[PDB]
Amino acid sequence: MIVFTDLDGTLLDERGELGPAREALERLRALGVPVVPVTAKTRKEVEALGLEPPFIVENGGGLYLPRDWPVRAGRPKGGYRVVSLAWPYRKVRARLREAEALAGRPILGYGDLTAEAVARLTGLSREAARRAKAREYDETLVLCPEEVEAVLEALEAVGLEWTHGGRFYHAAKGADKGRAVARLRALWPDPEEARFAVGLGDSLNDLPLFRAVDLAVYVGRGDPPEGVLATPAPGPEGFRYAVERYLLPRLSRR
Amino acid sequence: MIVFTDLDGTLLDERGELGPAREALERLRALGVPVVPVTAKTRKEVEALGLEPPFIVENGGGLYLPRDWPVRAGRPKGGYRVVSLAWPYRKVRARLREAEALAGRPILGYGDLTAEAVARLTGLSREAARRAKAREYDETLVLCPEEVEAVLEALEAVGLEWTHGGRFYHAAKGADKGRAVARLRALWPDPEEARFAVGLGDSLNDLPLFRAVDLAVYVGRGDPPEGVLATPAPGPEGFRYAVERYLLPR
Numbered sequence: 088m089i090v091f092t093d094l095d096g097t098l099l100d101e102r103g104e105l106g107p108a109r110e111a112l113e114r115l116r117a118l119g120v121p122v123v124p125v126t127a128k129t130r131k132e133v134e135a136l137g138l139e140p141p142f143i144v145e146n147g148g149g150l151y152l153p154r155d156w157p158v159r160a161g162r163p164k165g166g167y168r169v170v171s172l173a174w175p176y177r178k179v180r181a182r183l184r185e186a187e188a189l190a191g192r193p194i195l196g197y198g199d200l201t202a203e204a205v206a207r208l209t210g211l212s213r214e215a216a217r218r219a220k221a222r223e224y225d226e227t228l229v230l231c232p233e234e235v236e237a238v239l240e241a242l243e244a245v246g247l248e249w250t251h252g253g254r255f256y257h258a259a260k261g262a263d264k265g266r267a268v269a270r271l272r273a274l275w276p277d278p279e280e281a282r283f284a285v286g287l288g289d290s291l292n293d294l295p296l297f298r299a300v301d302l303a304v305y306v307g308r309g310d311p312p313e314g315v316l317a318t319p320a321p322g323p324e325g326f327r328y329a330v331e332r333y334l335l336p337r338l339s340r341r
Numbered sequence: 342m343i344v345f346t347d348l349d350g351t352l353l354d355e356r357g358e359l360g361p362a363r364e365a366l367e368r369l370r371a372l373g374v375p376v377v378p379v380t381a382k383t384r385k386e387v388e389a390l391g392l393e394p395p396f397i398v399e400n401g402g403g404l405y406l407p408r409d410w411p412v413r414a415g416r417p418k419g420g421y422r423v424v425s426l427a428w429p430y431r432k433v434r435a436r437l438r439e440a441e442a443l444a445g446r447p448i449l450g451y452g453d454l455t456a457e458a459v460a461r462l463t464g465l466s467r468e469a470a471r472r473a474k475a476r477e478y479d480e481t482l483v484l485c486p487e488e489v490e491a492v493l494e495a496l497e498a499v500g501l502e503w504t505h506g507g508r509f510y511h512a513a514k515g516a517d518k519g520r521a522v523a524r525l526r527a528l529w530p531d532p533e534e535a536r537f538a539v540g541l542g543d544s545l546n547d548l549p550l551f552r553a554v555d556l557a558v559y560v561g562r563g564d565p566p567e568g569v570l571a572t573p574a575p576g577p578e579g580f581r582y583a584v585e586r587y588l589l590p591r
């Protein structure tokens with residue numbers, strides 16, 4: 088079993104911290120069950136949480152592996168090995184200018200904003216906002232609700248893909264959480280261990296994750312997507328519940 | 342006679358330079374008639390055009406005078422004395438943060454954006470965008486058409502004032518082109534020279550300017566405000582027309 092988990096609104100509390108999930112994560116570690124973050128966050132943000140690879144960043148844009156992963160893949164990038172699945176940020180940003188020209192409306196993303204502005208918009212500290220701005224694949228958009236319909240159509244017209252991560256829309260090309268999870272499972276050193284995948288998440292950007300796993304669990308607000316399990320409470324309390332009710336039983340058996 | 346002139350759309354053209362206005366300006370110079378730019382642009386932008394003081398920037402937020410102006414006013418700053426008429430930018434920005442609270446939504450302006458972003462949104466070069474970001478009084482807001490009304494109501498609720506510049510909304514407190522014109526006229530060394538003021542503007546946001554002068558000329562497109570002269574063609578062509586038809590004869 089491998090557990091693939093989203094971060095914001097799933098494993099992380101409302102302040103972006105891992106505290107509330109520690110107990111459940113320790114249960115999993117004790118049982119030798121690997122946990123793989125699969126997130127809209129950047130590599131810099133994941134590193135700041137103290138999370139080690141393998142992990143998947145920017146909505147599946149990048150798969151990061153340990154430098155000594157037994158299966159040789161990707162290219163060395165700063166102490167890791169990286170498998171790039173999506174277009175680079177620079178290309179997304181260039182194509183966004185074309186979308187903006189079509190929409191006839193400004194389309195602002197983090198790349199247009201100061202760290203100070205991103206901090207104000209997100210509730211992050213200035214330092215954390217700098218990490219959120221260090222994007223390699225995916226752009227986070229800052230859209231007024233009134234312009235969303237027009238903007239999304241403009242993104243499609245210019246060949247970009249969009250998703251939504253809980254509070255913000257994102258634009259990218261080739262970044263899909265399920266594509267990335269599939270790739271990582273195919274690169275797993277122990278085929279048996281990778282045979283059964285669990286996926287937990289809370290937002291639209293997790294729908295492809297749920298399709299790529301064998302057991303899907305929704306810990307967001309409201310009703311779950313069809314065929315995905317719910318928990319009584321959202322976020323880390325939902326993650327904890329899922330570990331204790333859905334996973335632990337499956338880990339003994341017979 | 343003093344000629345107060347808006348920049349963009351009036352003295353400047355599509356790309357932002359002097360069309361058939363160079364000659365019109367040299368004529369006024371030859372007659373020893375002062376020309377005072379009155380603009381939404383920053384001091385750094387006006388300097389880049391090579392314009393010498395006196396000039397009025399940021400929609401009347403600041404009046405810049407030569408350091409050696411014969412009438413003592415304002416605060417010394419290098420080659421200038423500056424008369425600040427409006428709240429400083431930092432204070433406007435702080436009030437904006439409050440306005441966001443009431444509006445329950447982000448209110449973004451140039452201060453929140455990179456020079457690269459400002460350049461893309463305005464059509465300016467990165468270098469020109471950096472100068473447009475060097476604001477001392479007034480903030481340029483970046484608003485989608487559908488959010489404008491909610492935002493304006495919030496700005497006013499927190500004690501800010503707003504104006505429309507031609508493409509962007511602006512927020513400030515105490516920046517008014519007419520107030521700045523009246524102040525400069527009162528600070529003019531030779532009262533006889535400032536007795537008759539002319540005001541040329543390309544837009545309706547030049548109404549405060551039009552009210553503060555004795556002869557108002559609209560060199561924009563379509564009908565001019567009531568009590569304001571017009572030209573057949575806008576721009577420096579309008580400026581030239583206006584100078585030839587309305588001024589030179591005096």
Ligand SMILES: O=C(O)[C@@H](CO)O[C@H]1O[C@H](CO)[C@@H](O)[C@H](O)[C@@H]1O
Nearest residue numbers: 095127128209219227252253254255
């Ligand atoms: O889209 C969102 O709602 C969130 C959560 O998915 O991600 C963005 O917002 C987060 C901050 O709220 C950043 O940490 C991420 O990098 C990204 O920019």
Ligand SMILES: O=C(O)[C@@H](CO)O[C@H]1O[C@H](CO)[C@@H](O)[C@H](O)[C@@H]1O
Nearest residue numbers: 381382383463473481506507508509
């Ligand atoms: O609001 C506008 O439409 C123009 C003209 O009024 O001023 C803003 O926009 C100009 C760029 O178009 C800048 O040069 C000014 O500094 C200011 O930010």
Ligand SMILES: [Mg+2]
Nearest residue numbers: 093095096289
């Ligand atoms: Mg999430």
Ligand SMILES: [Mg+2]
Nearest residue numbers: 347348349350
């Ligand atoms: Mg103008």
